Amino acid sequence: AALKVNVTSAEGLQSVLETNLGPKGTLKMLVDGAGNIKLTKDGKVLLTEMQIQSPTAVLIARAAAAQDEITGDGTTTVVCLVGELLRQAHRFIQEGVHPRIITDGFEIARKESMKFLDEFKISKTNLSNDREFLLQVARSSLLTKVDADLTEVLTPIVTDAVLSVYDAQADNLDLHMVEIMQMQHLSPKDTTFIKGLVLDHGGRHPDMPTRVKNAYVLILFYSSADQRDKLAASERKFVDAKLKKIIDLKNEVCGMDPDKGFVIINQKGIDPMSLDVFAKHNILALRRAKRRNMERLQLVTGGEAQNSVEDLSPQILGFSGLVYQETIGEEKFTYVTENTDPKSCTILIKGSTHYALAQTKDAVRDGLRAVANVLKDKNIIPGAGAFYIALSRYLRSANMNKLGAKGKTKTGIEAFAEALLVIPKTLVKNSGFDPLDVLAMVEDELDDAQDSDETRYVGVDLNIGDSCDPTIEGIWDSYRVLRNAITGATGIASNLLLCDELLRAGRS
Amino acid sequence: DAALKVNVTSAEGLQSVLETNLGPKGTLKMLVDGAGNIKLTKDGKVLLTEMQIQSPTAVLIARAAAAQDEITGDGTTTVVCLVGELLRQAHRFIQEGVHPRIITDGFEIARKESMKFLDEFKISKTNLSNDREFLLQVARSSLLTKVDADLTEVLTPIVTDAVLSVYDAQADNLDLHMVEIMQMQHLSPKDTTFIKGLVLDHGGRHPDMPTRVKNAYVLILNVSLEYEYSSADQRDKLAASERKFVDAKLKKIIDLKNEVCGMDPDKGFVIINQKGIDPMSLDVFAKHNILALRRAKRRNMERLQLVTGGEAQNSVEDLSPQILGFSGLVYQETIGEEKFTYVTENTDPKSCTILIKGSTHYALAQTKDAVRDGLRAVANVLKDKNIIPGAGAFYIALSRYLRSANMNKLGAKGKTKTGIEAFAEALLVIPKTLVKNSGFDPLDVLAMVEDELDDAQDSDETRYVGVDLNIGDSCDPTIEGIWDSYRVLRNAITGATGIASNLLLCDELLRAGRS
Amino acid sequence: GEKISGDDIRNQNVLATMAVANVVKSSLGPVGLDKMLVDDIGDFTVTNDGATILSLLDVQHPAGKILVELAQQQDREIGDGTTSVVIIASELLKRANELVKNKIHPTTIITGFRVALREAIRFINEVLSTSVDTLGKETLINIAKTSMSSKIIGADSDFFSNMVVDALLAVKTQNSKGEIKYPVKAVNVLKAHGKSATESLLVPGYALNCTVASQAMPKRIAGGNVKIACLDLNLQKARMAMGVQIDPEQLEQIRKREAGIVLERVKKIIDAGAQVVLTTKGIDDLCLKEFVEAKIMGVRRCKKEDLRRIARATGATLVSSMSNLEGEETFESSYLGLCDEVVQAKFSDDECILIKGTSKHSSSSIILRGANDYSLDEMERSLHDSLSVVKRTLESGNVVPGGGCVEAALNIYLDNFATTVGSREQLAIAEFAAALLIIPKTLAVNAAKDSSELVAKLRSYHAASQMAKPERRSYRNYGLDLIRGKIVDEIHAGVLEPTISKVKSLKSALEACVAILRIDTMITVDPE
Amino acid sequence: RQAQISNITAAKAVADVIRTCLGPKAMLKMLLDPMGGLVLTNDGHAILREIDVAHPAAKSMLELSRTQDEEVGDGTTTVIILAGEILAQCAPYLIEKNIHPVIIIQALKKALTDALEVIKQVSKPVDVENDAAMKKLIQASIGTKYVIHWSEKMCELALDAVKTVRKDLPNFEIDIKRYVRVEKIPGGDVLDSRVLKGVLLNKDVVHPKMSRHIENPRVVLLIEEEQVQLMCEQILAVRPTLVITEKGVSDLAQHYLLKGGCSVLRRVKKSDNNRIARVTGATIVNRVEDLKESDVGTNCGLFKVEMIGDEYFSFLDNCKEPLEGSGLQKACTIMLRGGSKDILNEIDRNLQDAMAVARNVMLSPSLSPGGGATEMAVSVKLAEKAKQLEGIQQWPYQAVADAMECIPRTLIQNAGGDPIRLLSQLRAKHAQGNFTTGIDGDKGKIVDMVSYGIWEPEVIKQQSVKTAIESACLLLRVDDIVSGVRK
C-alpha cells in the first residue's frame, strides 16, 4: 500500500545534481546562514548543508562519504542512478514485479561489471614517473571543476607536487603533504608552486634579514604596595631567562658575524624586548607562529622540533641553501628553496575573492586525491563515459551467456543497461545538444570498432557533439574511481529496492 | 514547458477507473448518487456521467467514447487503457528531448501500417449460411465482459436467435427494427426468457376486462380521451353534456365492432389511449367484451405494423379495418398493478421482443445495460462479413512486426523509431490488464505466449495464439471461439490515434477568465 | 457635516486640479499622444480630447467639476484644440498659492487678472492677422495644415488638407436673416475599415449608409429630379384594445383587413413617384414583396436621427402616419422634394445613397476609410472638431500664429503694462505673464527638447519687433519649429490658428481661476 | 515609465500564448474558460476573443485579429503572431533610448515602403484557374491542422468550391461566402461527403405514418379541430409535398396534413428558412393564407433519407440548374460528415479560410515565396538599408529586422531545430544565391521553396504586414493609462 509512496516522492531527487555533471555543466549557488558562499560542482558540499525534503536523501548523502575518501568528483552518478531506478519502478515494478526480483538481477550484474571492468582498463607504468601521462590526466580532471585558465596553471603544479613524494616502493601518502595555504592575493591564475617549504610568518622588524642563504631555525598577598612590585619584577625575569640563554647559545657556530640568516619560531607570545637584543646579532623572531607546520623542517635541513628553550642542540640548527621572504599584505611569507633533498612541498594558492578561492580550494583538494590513486594503482580507466556506454551494450545482449532465472532476471538486466545510458545523455543535455543524435553516433562507433577486429575505446566530445578518443583527448580515470563507485552503485540501488514500507509515527 | 507535465500527471489517474472493468474476467464497481439510483455496471458511459472529475482532460476521454458507442457500445475500456500506457510513456520519451509531435507523427505511420496488416490477420466468414456455432462463440465472449456466467449461458441462445430474425439477401440490418425491451420485476433475473413474437406492456384495468382471448382487435388512440346561468337548470345541462362527447364515440364503437361479425363476442378487442380514460366508457366496454387501458404509452404501438400489419391511429375520425389487427393466441399475465398482455402464434413476425424479468431496479439495470450493449455489438458482426480474431491476439501479433522493421519501414533515425517502439509496446498493456483482472501474473503468461509465437513463426505455420484467463494458459481464438468484428477493431485503433494526438500536442495549460 | 476652513481647502483644490491636469498635458502640441482610461465597466476610449475625458473621469473633490464644465463650454464655442486650451487655466492655480500666502487680497488677485485680460484684447489686436495677410492661396489649406496638429493624424496631412476644404465649400447656406455661414454639425462623417485615408470619398451632399432589404430590388437609380419619402409609420400586426378585448375566420379577418390596407397604403406611395422610400421598423416578407413590385427603393431598420436631417436637407415632409383632412389614408404629392443629382455608389464592400444638390438646405458628408475602429476613434473626434475651425476661419478672417507665438508675445506687452499699473497689482501681472509662458515651455517637454533656449531666443525676436515702431526688416521675426528647434516664420511652415479660438480660450480661463479663488471653505453633507 | 510598463507587459505574455499556433508543427494549449468548460484548439481567433486579461490595453489588440479576419480573412495560421510580435523588439527602446515613440512612426513608415519593394522583387505570376499549383497552394495554408491525413480529400472540396459558388459579377471573384452553408455531421468518415445543391436539416418528422421520399418537391416555409383543418386545406390547395414551420406542430395538424401526402418539420431556425427560400425558390410565408402557386419548388432533383442510429435527419439529393453569370448570389452547399468533433471543427475553420485565402489568390494573381522565406528575404534588404541609412532613426529601423527574423524562428522552436546555424545560413544564402531559400516544414533544411512546393500570395504578405505595422502603433501612441475612472 505504502510501497509506492517512497518511489514517487523520492523520484524528484535526480534533478538536484542532474545539471552538475560534466565539464561543460553549470554551477549552483549555495549560501548558508553563516555567510559562507560555496559555488562548486562538488557533491560533498551540496549534499551536506542543503536542506532535504524526502527522508530518502539521508542515505544518498551518506553514500557520498565513501566517495569522498576515494573519488569526490563526479559523485552525481550516485543520484542519477537512483532517479532512473525509481522511474523503472513505475514501468517494470508497476507491472507487478516483486521489488526483490529486480534486485537480484543487479547483484548478479555487479559481478559481471567487475569481470568487464578489468578488460576495459588500460595499464600504465608509474615507476618511470612519466610526466606526459600525468599532464593529460590532471588536465581533464580540472575541466570538470574549473575552467581552462586555472587548468593550465594548476596542471604543472599538481604534476610536480606528486613527484616530490616517491620512493623505491612507490609509497605516496596523502597524509604527508597536507597543509595548503589559502589567501587572497593578485588573481587566481597567479598561483605559484614551491618545491620547498613555505612559512606563513616573517620578519616584523626593519633590521630582520630580507634575503639570506643559510638559516638556523630555532623552534619554540603583600603587605605594602612596594612589595607588589617585587612580583612584577620576578615575572619579568621568567621571560628574561629565556631570552638571555638564546644570546649565548646562538654563539655556538658564529655569533660574532651576523652575515648569515637566523630564525626563531615560537608558538606563544614572546617578550617584545627580543627584537631589540636580536637586532645586534641580526636574529629573526616571529609573532604567533603555528606548531604542526614545524614537523616538516626535519625533512629538509635535518633539524629537530623543539618545544621549550632549555634543550638546544646544534642538531636542531640546519643548513639551508637559499631563503627568500616576500611581503604580501600584513603577513610576510618566508620561502625555503634550493633544498638538497626536500621530502615535501607546500601548496600556495593566490586568489581575489572568497568565492574565487572556493572554486580553487575544492579543485586542489579533489585534484591531489585523484592523482594519488593514479600513482598507487597503475591501472587507469578511460573516462568520458566510455565504460557506461560499453557495459550497457555488453549486458544488453546476453541470452545463453549470462541469464539466470528466466524472465525474472532479464527484466532487471534491461533496467541496469538503460540506467547507465542516462549518464552520457546527461552530459549532452548539459551541453545543450540532442542526446538522441549524439548517442546514435556513439553506438555506431562502437559497432564499427568491434566489427573491425580491433580493440578501441571511443569517447564523447561535448564541444562538437561527436565521438572522440579519450586517449588522444587525455580524459582518464583511476581504476579505484569506478571500483568503489560501481560497488557502491549496487548498494545505493538495493537500499530503496529492498525498502518495504515507511510509516508516519514517532514520539512528540 | 513547466506546465507540460501538469496535464500529463493529472490525467494518469484516469486509467484505474475502468481498469478493473476490462475483460471477461473483470469485476464490477459500484457508483451510487444522491437521487436513489444504484448503478452497478462495467459500462463507462454511466460511470463517467455523474462522477465528479478533477483533471479537465477526462472530458475529452468521454468525447472519444461517443464514436465508440455508435460503432461498438461495448468494450470501450481499451480506449482509456491505451492512453494510460501512453501517459506513462509520455514523460519517458519526451524527457529525452524528442518533440511531442514527432511521436505523434510516428503513430500516423504505425496506424497506416496497422491497417495494411489488419486485412491479413482477419478471417473472412460467410453470414449467409447462418452458422450457429460461430454465433454462439462470439456472443459468449461478449456476455462474459458484461454479466456473470449464470446470465451468460441463458442469454447466449437469446442473443443468437435474436440477430437471426433481422437479415436479408442484401445484408440489410436495421438497428431500429428490433429495439423495445420489456422491463418487468418478476421471479429472479436469471429467469429471463426470449420471445420471437411481440409483447404488450399494458393490460386490462377493470375486473370485467377479458381474461383470455384468441383473435385480438387493437384500436389505437392518442389524443386525450378524458374530457374536462339564469337558473340551476343550466348547471344540470352543462354537466350532462360533458358525457355526451364520450358517449357519441361509444355509439360508433358498438356498431363498427359488430359490423364484421357481431354474433359471438368471444374474440379479443382492445382500445389504447395515451391519457386517462373516462370511467363512463368502462360500462360500455364491460358488456361489449372490450379491453380498456389507463395511461398507456405510444411508441410501442408502431410494432404492430412490422408483424401483423397494424396501424397506430391518432384521432377518432379515421377508423378502418387496417387499424384492427389479428393474433393467433393471447396470454394475459397479471403482475403488480398493471396486467401484461402477450401476443404469440404470429404468422411471420419480423421482430423479436426481449422479455426480461427480475427482482428490483439494480438487478434489472445490469441486464438492461447488457442486452442493449450486447445486441448492438453482435448486430455489427452481421453487417461486415470480415471477422477479426479476438482475445487480444492482434495486439500482440502486430507488435512483433513493429518491433522488427529496419530496412522495411524506417524513415528518420531515432525520431520515427521512438514512436515505433512506443506504439509497439503501448498495445501490450491490454493483455497485461486482462491477466491482472483475473488475479494471475501477466508477465509469466505473456512469456509463454511469446515462446509459443516464436515456435509457431519458426516452424513456418499460420496460427493464432490467444490467452485463456480461466486456466491461466495460452489458447487459440479459433478453438475457443473468441472473435471480433472488423469495424470494431479498425475504429478502435484509429479512434485511439485521434484521441492520443489531443493530449500529446497540448503544449501548456493556461488559466484565463473572470474569477 | 464635515467642514474645514483656512488654506486647507484651497491647497487640496489646487493639488487635485493640478494632478488631473498634468495627465492631459502630454497631449499638447503635434508631439502629443493619446491616453487610455479604464472605466472598470468594460468600456474604454483612447483620445486626447479633454471634453470627453473630463466628463468620464470621476471628480473627487467638488472643486474639480469647475474645470469639467469649462471643457463643456469650449464645445459650444469652438470645440477644437482642447489640448491647448483647458491646460492654460490650470497653471493659474499653481502660482495663486504663493499670492494667497502674501498679504494680497483674493479680490486684488482677481482684479489684477481682470485688468490683465481686458487690456490683453488690444495686445492680440497688435499681432492680429487680417483676412488676406499672408499668401493664403485658398486660405483654407493654410489653416487645414494647422488643424492636423494637436492630433496624431498629421502624417495624413497630404490628404486631409484637401478632404476637409473641398467638402465644406458646398455647405454655404443663407440663414439667420440673410447671414452667410456654414451650418456646423450638419456634416455626417462615415468610417470604413481597410486600406488607408487615401480611399476616402467626398460627397457634396448627404450620404446615408444602408442597403436594400431584398437582394432582388434594384440597387441603382440614376437621373435627375429624384424624389425621396421618409415614412416612419410602423407596419406590424396591430395590438388589441384597452383590455376589453373582443368565428376565428372573422378574427383572422382583422389581420386580413389590416394587411390589406397596408398593401393599399403602399399603393398610394406608388402613385407619388418617389424613387427612394424609407421605413423605420422592420417588416416581414409580405410587405417586403410589395416594395419589390412598387419599383421603389426601400430601406428598413432606419434610425430616426438619420431621417431628421434628410427632411431638412432635401425639403420633403417627414410622414410618420398617412392621413389627410378627410378620413382617407393616402400620400399627397406636396410632401416630396427635389434634388439635383441622387445616385447610390458602392464603397468598401457596401453601398450608400448619395443625395446631392439639395435646394432646401445645402450640406455635405465626408465618407472616410481607415484601418479599424480603434484607429479611427481618434480620427473621428478630431475631424468633427476641425469642422469648427474652418467655420470660424471663413466667418472671421482674424487668425493668430500658433506654436507658442501668442504666449511669448503677451509677456512683452505685460512687462510694460506691469509698470504702468504698479502699486500692489504689479506683482499680479508678473505672475500672470509668467503663467502664460508655462504652456509653451510644456510644449517642448512632450518633444524632449529645451524650451528655455527657444523662449529666450523667440522672445528676443518679438522684443525687437515691439521696441522698433518704424522697423526694411533687420529685426522682426516669429514662429517656433518643434522638429528643427529653430525660429522661422510660420508663413513657410503654415501654422496659423483663428483669433476667436484664442480670445475665447483666455476669456473663459479668467472666470475659471476666479471660481477657485472665491471659495473660502467647503462643506459636505453625508447622503441619506 | 509608470504607465509604459503596463502597456508593454500587456501584450508581452500574449506572444507566448499564440507562439504554438504557427507552422505545420503548431501545437495546442489547454485553456479553462470562466463558463466552467474547456477550450483546446490551435486557432487563436476563438481564443483571443474568449480570453480575459487584466490589462484592457491588451484587449484592444484582441480585436486586431478579428479586424484582420474581416478585412483580409487570413493570418490565423502565421501572421496572428506578427500582430503581437512587433512589440517584442520595441521593449529595449523606452527603457534604453528614452525617446518618444514618434520617431518609431517615421521608422516604421520607411520600413513599410522598403518591405513592399522586397515582396514585389520576389513576386511571380501564377495561373489561378490551373489546378496544378492551386492544389498545393490550398494544402499549404490548411496543412497545419489535423486534416493532413485527409488533406488530399479536403483539397478536392476546397478546389471545387472556389470554381462553383464564387463566379463573379468585371471585378475579380467578389461575392459573399456567408450564404454558402457547410453541414457538419459528426461520426463516420468524409468519404460520403458530396457537393449537394439543396439544404439538409437535422429535425425529424412529426408524424409516424408519413413516408420519406419525393420526386418533384413543393416547399412551403411557414372549434380548433375544424379551424386548423380548414387551415390545412389552404396549405394543401397547391398540393405541397413538404411543409416547414418555425414553431411547433400540433397533433391535430399531423392527421389533416397526412391526407395531402406531405412531410412536416418543426423547430426550424430562421437561418435555415433563409437558405431554403433561396435554394428551393419558395418564398417565406408569414400569414398562412398568403400561400400561392409562386412558392413551388425549383431545381430539386431527388429527395433521400440520411438517418443516424438515434434520430432522423432531412437529406436532399444533388441536382443541377438548366441553362438553355449572376455570381452575386449563389445557392449551393457542401455536405461534410466528420469523424470526430476535434477534426470536424478544424475543417470548418479550414474550408472557410481556404475559400478566404483562395479569394485573395484570385484577387492578386501574383505569388510570393511562402513558408518563412519572405520574412528572411525582407530582413536582408531591411538590414542593408539600415547600414546605408546611418542616422538617428537607424536604431528603431534596424530593430524591425529582428522582428522579420523571429517569424521563422517561431517555426524553428516549434519544430525543434537549431535556429543559430539555420538563420545564419539563410541570411548568408539569401544575400548571395537567391531569396527562394527557406526553412523546411519538417526537417528544417536549406531546401528552396520552389522545389518544396509552398508559396504564399503577394496580397497576403503585403496586407498582413502593413496592417500589423499600423496596428502595432496603437499602444505606441498611448503615452498614459488611467485606472479607476468609473464611468
Q: List the grid coordinates of C366.
A: 465626408
φ, ψ of residue A350 in degrees (nearest 5):
-115, 140
CB-based contact C34:D477 (threshold 8 Å):
yes
Residues of D in contact with C155 (CB under 8 A): 105, 109
CB-based contact B288:B210 (threshold 8 Å):
no
Domain range spanning residue B30? 1-125+386-515
B506 and D CB contact within 8 Å: yes
Strand, coil or helix: A377:
coil
Q: Give me the active site residues of D, please.
A: 43, 76-77, 353
Residue B304 distance to chain D (closest CA, Å): 13
Q: What secondary structure does DSSP assign to C122-175, as a single string?
A: HHHHHS-B-SSSS--SSSSHHHHHHHTTTSGGGGGHHHHHHHHHHHHTT--EEE
CB-based contact A477:A388 (threshold 8 Å):
no
Angstrom distances, CA of residue A464 to CA of A353, A429, A443, A459, C105: 33, 13, 17, 12, 86
Q: List the grid coordinates of C527.
A: 447622503
The residue count of chain B comes to 515
- The residue among A279, A314, A342 that closes a domain is A342
Q: Are strands C399-401 and A459-461 parallel, antiparallel or unpaired?
A: unpaired
Q: List the grid coordinates of C152.
A: 496624431
Residues of D in contact with B509 (CB under 8 A): 29-30, 32
Whether residue D32 and residue B510 make contact (CB cut-off 8 A), yes or no, is yes
CA dihedral C124, C127, C131, C137 (to 10 degrees): -130
Superfamily name with CATH number, domain C132-203+362-397 = TCP-1-like chaperonin intermediate domain (3.30.260.10)
Q: Give me the active site residues of C, please.
A: 49, 82-83, 385
Strand, coil or helix: B361:
helix
Q: How many Cβ atoms sit within 10 Å of the Cβ of residue D321?
A: 10
**Is there a single domain that holds both residue B176 and residue B299?**
no
**Is there a single domain that holds both residue D186 and residue D213?**
no
Instruction: Tell me the C-alpha distance between A8 and A6, whole Å.
Output: 6
CATH number of C1-131+398-528: 1.10.560.10
Integer Rg of chain D from CA: 28
Instruction: Tell me the C-alpha distance between C108 and A411, whole Å.
Output: 103
Q: Work out how many CB contacts closer than 8 A connect B with D.
A: 96
Q: List the grid coordinates of D378.
A: 525582407
Whether residue B447 and residue A96 make contact (CB cut-off 8 A), yes or no, is no
D5 and C CB contact within 8 Å: no
Residue C361 distance to chain D (closest CA, Å): 36
Residue C42 distance to chain D (closest CA, Å): 8
Q: List the grid coordinates of B229.
A: 346561468
Strand, coil or helix: B269:
strand
Q: List the grid coordinates of C207.
A: 450620404
Kindly state the helix (H) or strand (E) to which residue D382 belongs, with its residue range: helix D373-389
φ, ψ of residue B249 in degrees (nearest 5):
-80, -25
D340 and B CB contact within 8 Å: yes
Strand, coil or helix: D112:
helix
**Is there a single domain that holds both residue B121 and residue B231?**
no
CA angle C187, C193, C196 (to 5 degrees): 85
CB-based contact B436:B428 (threshold 8 Å):
no
CA angle A178, A182, A185 (to 5 degrees): 145
Instruction: Tell me the C-alpha distance between A89 and B92, whole Å.
Output: 13
CB-based contact B485:B127 (threshold 8 Å):
no
What are the residues facing D205 on neighbouring strands?
D265
Instruction: Tell me the C-alpha distance between B453 and B434, whole Å.
Output: 19
**Is there a single domain that holds both residue A428 and residue A469?**
yes
Helices H / strands E in chain A, number of each = 17, 16
CB neighbour list of residue D383: distance below 8 Å, 6 or more residues apart: D398, D401
**Is there a single domain that holds both residue B142 and residue B115?**
no
CB neighbour list of residue A30: distance below 8 Å, 6 or more residues apart: A37, A38, A39, A45, A46, A49, A50
Residues of D in contact with B64 (CB under 8 A): 340
Q: List the grid coordinates of C83.
A: 489640448
Of D472, D479, D480, nearest to D396 by C-alpha is D472
- The residue among D282, D305, D329 that closes a domain is D329
Q: Are strands B216-220 and B268-272 parallel, antiparallel or unpaired?
A: parallel
**Is there a single domain that holds both residue B419 and residue B468?**
yes
Instruction: Tell me the C-alpha distance between A74 and A489, whole Å.
Output: 13
Of A14, A74, A64, nearest to A42 by C-alpha is A74
Whether residue B510 and residue D28 make contact (CB cut-off 8 A), yes or no, is no
A436 and B CB contact within 8 Å: yes
Counted domains in chain D: 3
D38 and B CB contact within 8 Å: yes
CB-based contact A314:A252 (threshold 8 Å):
yes
Domain range spanning residue D475? 1-126+366-487
The CATH number for B188's domain is 3.30.260.10
Angstrom distances, CA of residue B52 to CA of B58, B62, B69: 10, 13, 21
Sign of the CA dihedral with B139 first, then B143, B148, and B152 last: negative
**Is there a single domain that holds both residue A11 and residue A53?**
yes
Of B88, B415, B444, the CB nearest to A91: B88
**Is there a single domain that holds both residue B390 and residue B421?**
yes
Instruction: Tell me the C-alpha distance between C285 and C264, whole Å.
Output: 16
Q: Which residue has the cell 477534426?
A: D343
Of C228, C216, C239, nearest to C285 by C-alpha is C216
Alpha helices in A250-284 (DSSP H): 274-280
Of A488, A421, A390, nearest to A88 by C-alpha is A421
Residues of D in contact with C36 (CB under 8 A): 56-57, 478, 480-482
Closest chain D residue to B175 measured between Cα atoms?
A: D309
Q: List the grid coordinates of A401.
A: 551467456
**Is there a single domain that holds both residue B191 and residue B227?**
no
Q: List the grid coordinates of B498.
A: 485521434
CB-based contact A446:A123 (threshold 8 Å):
no
CB neighbour list of residue B2: distance below 8 Å, 6 or more residues apart: none
Residues of A in contact with B97 (CB under 8 A): 429, 434-436
The CATH number for A13's domain is 1.10.560.10
The CATH number for D5's domain is 1.10.560.10
CB-based contact D193:D157 (threshold 8 Å):
yes
Chain C and chain B touch, per 3+ beta carbon pairs within 8 A = no
Of C33, C40, C285, the CB nearest to D283: C285
CB neighbour list of residue C57: distance below 8 Å, 6 or more residues apart: C20, C37, C68, D482, D485
**Is there a single domain that holds both residue D280 and residue D311?**
yes
Of B34, B375, B333, B427, nearest to B177 by C-alpha is B375
D415 and B CB contact within 8 Å: yes
The CATH number for D160's domain is 3.30.260.10
Residues of D in contact with B57 (CB under 8 A): 30
Counted domains in chain A: 3
Q: In angstroms, what is the resolution?
A: 5.6
**Is there a single domain that holds both residue D298 and residue D420?**
no
Instruction: Tell me the C-alpha distance between A412 and A434, whole Å.
Output: 27
Instruction: Tell me the C-alpha distance between C284 and C267, whole Å.
Output: 17
Side-chain-facing half-sphere of C492: CA atoms under 13 Å: 9
**Is there a single domain that holds both residue B210 and residue B262?**
yes
Q: List the grid coordinates of C319.
A: 410622414
Q: How many Cβ atoms sit within 10 Å of the Cβ of residue C247?
A: 8
Whether residue D483 and residue C38 make contact (CB cut-off 8 A), yes or no, is yes
The CATH number for D252's domain is 3.50.7.10
**Is there a single domain that holds both residue A10 and residue A97?**
yes
CB neighbour list of residue C501: distance below 8 Å, 6 or more residues apart: C78, C80, C81, C85, C389, C392
**What angle, 0 to 180 degrees and rounded to 10, lies between the N-to-C axes of helices C7-24 and C90-101?**
150
Instruction: Tell me the C-alpha distance between B90 and B83, whole Å.
Output: 10
